[PDB]
A paper describes a structure:
Binding of one of those antibodies, HL4E10, to epithelial γδ T cell surface-expressed JAML (Junctional Adhesion Molecule-Like) receptor leads to potent costimulation via phosphoinsositide-3-kinase recruitment, activation of Akt and MAP kinase pathways, and cytokine production, ultimately resulting in epithelial γδ T cell proliferation. Here, we report the first crystal structure of a hamster IgG Fab fragment and the complete cDNA sequence of the stimulatory antibody HL4E10 which contains the first example of a hamster lambda light chain. The primary structure of HL4E10 is the first example of a hamster lambda light chain sequence, and its heavy chain sequence is only the second known complete hamster heavy chain sequence. The binding of HL4E10 to γδ T cell-expressed JAML induces potent costimulation and ultimately cell proliferation, suggesting that humanized HL4E10 derivatives, might be useful therapeutic tools for treatment of γδ T cell dysfunction-associated diseases, such as chronic non-healing wounds or cancer.
The crystal structure of the hamster HL4E10 Fab resembles that of a typical Fab. The two HL4E10 Fab molecules (chains LH and AB) in the asymmetric unit do not significantly differ from each other in their overall structure or in the conformation of the combining site. The elbow angles between the variable and constant domains are 193.5° and 189.5° for chains LH and AB, respectively. The HL4E10 combining site is composed of a relatively flat central area (formed by ValL31, ThrH98, TrpL96, IleH50, HisH95, and PheH96), surrounded by more protruding residues (AspH31, TyrH32 of CDR H1; HisH53-AspH58 of CDR H2; AspL30, TyrL32 of CDR L1; ArgL53 of CDR L2; and TrpL91 and SerL95A of CDR L3). A number of aromatic residues, i.e. three tyrosines (TyrL32, TyrH32, TyrH97), one phenylalanine (PheH96), two tryptophans (TrpL91, TrpL96), and two histidines (HisH35, HisH95); and two aliphatic residues (ValL31, IleH50) render the center of the HL4E10 combining site rather hydrophobic in nature. The side chains of two residues, namely TyrL32 and TyrH97, rise significantly above the central plain of the combining site, but do not exhibit any significant differences when comparing both HL4E10 molecules in the asymmetric unit, suggesting that the HL4E10 combining site is mostly rigid and structurally optimized for ligand binding. The rigid arrangement of the HL4E10 CDR loops is maintained by an extensive network of hydrophobic stacking and CH-π interactions, and is further stabilized by H-bonds between different CDR loops, as well as between CDR loops and framework residues. In the CDR H3, 5 out of 6 consecutive residues have large, aromatic side chains (HisH95, PheH96, TyrH97, TyrH99, PheH100) and are tightly packed between the CDR H1, L1, L2, and L3 loops, thus constricting any significant motion.
Author numbering:
A (entry chain L): 1 to 9, 11 to 95, 95A, 95B, 96 to 106, 106A, 107 to 166, 168, ...
B (entry chain H): 1 to 82, 82A, 82B, 82C, 83 to 128, 136 to 154, 156 to 157, 162 to 169, ...
């Protein structure tokens, strides 16, 4: 049951060194390989056998494998280098190929912008169905990673929640979070809140029936 | 020259058995093995198995007892089968060449969804603000399958629009759209949104109004 540990995210301003690290038991015994993957596309072999390039790949990728850490270097990062990156290896113990947990390398190319939140109440038209859907819409933020929390009368609300993944609009990212529930379990409560976290900033919007 | 393509269905239910053919060209299967790998939405790449150049096979432990790989070397076809399906089998499926330890050439990928959902037309609901420019919205709730077109005043509202990605729970999809309008225009001029769902043959207009 071999598993390769990989840090999930790696921010880096354009033209800086990005380092992604892959861990294992005796990772230097076996060869490591790295694949780049851009949203909705097949992986591409960027590095193989620890520190080797296939033809066609840029010279600004560079790998190494010592101790128990494999590492993929991106020197002088660019907009087109941003992607999900995956390390990989073989293991004899049980004949199988094992993939790393993946490192989403984000290449920052503009100021980090705060989100604009809008929290909509349920519609009369929906409430006649005896249902209630709150819509917390998040706009104009960068980079593309937010964290949403819901809270009713000051007690964290998890169940019934679902959030879209981020998605690029014009120049910045956008996302929504929904809270689904019964029509009267909305009318009962005093106040609802969606908390949208981004960077080291929280933005809050209230909604009280 | 050396290319791999995936073919097969993109919509199954938790009963059926999946069947994907990976078609090779440029090279011969007689002297190359082919891997299969999948990837659940926003999750890691998982190796499922391999069928070598010799015809020997080798599968993953967590997949085993319900996964089969075979081929047809004349047509250069490589086959994959997953019986006993569920929601969490839904993923992008890739086929990739074996070359020593690494995977040098990959397919483009084929999305597959496992879902017992039937073609349901959405419920469109308006979204007026709850008490220098205003933003309104349309909630397309509970539909299947994708996609769903969302417009505003039949294309007359191009600027200020924002269509967000669809989200899914208990089978059906949900999706919302919005329009920032100059504060003066609304509500002196009306704003309707136009939702289309070609799968359910449904076109539904909905005026957004103060409450």
């Amino acid at each position: 049951s071999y598993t390769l540990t990989q840090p999930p995210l790696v921010s880096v301003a354009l033209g800086q060194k990005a380092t992604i690290t892959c861990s294992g038991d005796k990772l230097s015994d076996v060869y490591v390989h790295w694949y780049q993957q851009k949203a909705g596309q097949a992986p591409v072999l960027v590095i193989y056998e620890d520190n080797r390039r296939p033809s066609g790949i840029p010279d600004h990728f560079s790998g190494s494998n010592s101790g128990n850490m494999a590492t993929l270097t991106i020197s002088k990062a660019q907009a087109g280098d941003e992607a999900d990156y995956y390390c990989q290896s073989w293991d004899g113990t049980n004949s199988a190929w094992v993939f790393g947990s993946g490192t989403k390398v984000t290449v920052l190319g503009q100021p980090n912008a705060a989100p604009s939140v809008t929290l909509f109440p349920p519609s009369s038209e929906e409430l006649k169905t005896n249902q209630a859907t709150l819509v917390c819409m998040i706009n104009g933020f960068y980079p593309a990673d937010v964290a949403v929390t819901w809270e009713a009368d000051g007690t964290p609300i998890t169940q019934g929640v679902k959030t879209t993944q981020p998605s690029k609009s014009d120049s910045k990212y956008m996302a929504t979070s929904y809270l689904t529930m019964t029509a009267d379990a909305w009318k009962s409560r005093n106040t609802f809140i969606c908390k949208v976290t981004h960077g080291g900033n929280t933005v809050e919007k209230s909604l009280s029936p | 020259q050396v290319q791999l393509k995936e073919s097969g269905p993109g919509l199954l239910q938790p009963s059926q058995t999946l069947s994907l053919t990976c078609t090779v060209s440029g090279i011969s299967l007689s002297d190359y093995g082919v891997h299969w790998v999948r990837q659940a939405p926003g999750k890691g790449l998982e190796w499922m198995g391999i069928i070598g150049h010799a015809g020997g096979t080798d599968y993953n432990s967590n997949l085993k007892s319900r996964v089969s790989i075979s081929r047809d070397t004349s047509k250069s076809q490589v086959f994959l089968k997953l019986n006993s399906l569920q929601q969490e089998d839904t993923a992008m499926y890739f086929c990739a060449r074996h070359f020593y330890t690494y995977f040098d050439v990959w397919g483009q990928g084929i999305q597959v969804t496992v879902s017992s959902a039937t073609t349901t037309a959405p419920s469109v609901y308006p979204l007026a603000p709850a008490c220098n420019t205003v933003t309104l919205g349309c909630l397309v709730k509970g539909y299947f399958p994708e996609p769903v077109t969302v417009s505003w005043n039949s294309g007359a509202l191009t600027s200020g629009v924002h269509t967000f990605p669809s989200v899914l729970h208990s089978g059906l999809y949900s999706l919302s759209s919005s329009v920032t309008v100059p504060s003066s225009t609304w509500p002196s001029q009306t704003v309707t949104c136009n939702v289309a769902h070609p799968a359910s043959s449904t076109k539904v207009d909905k005026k957004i109004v103060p409450g």
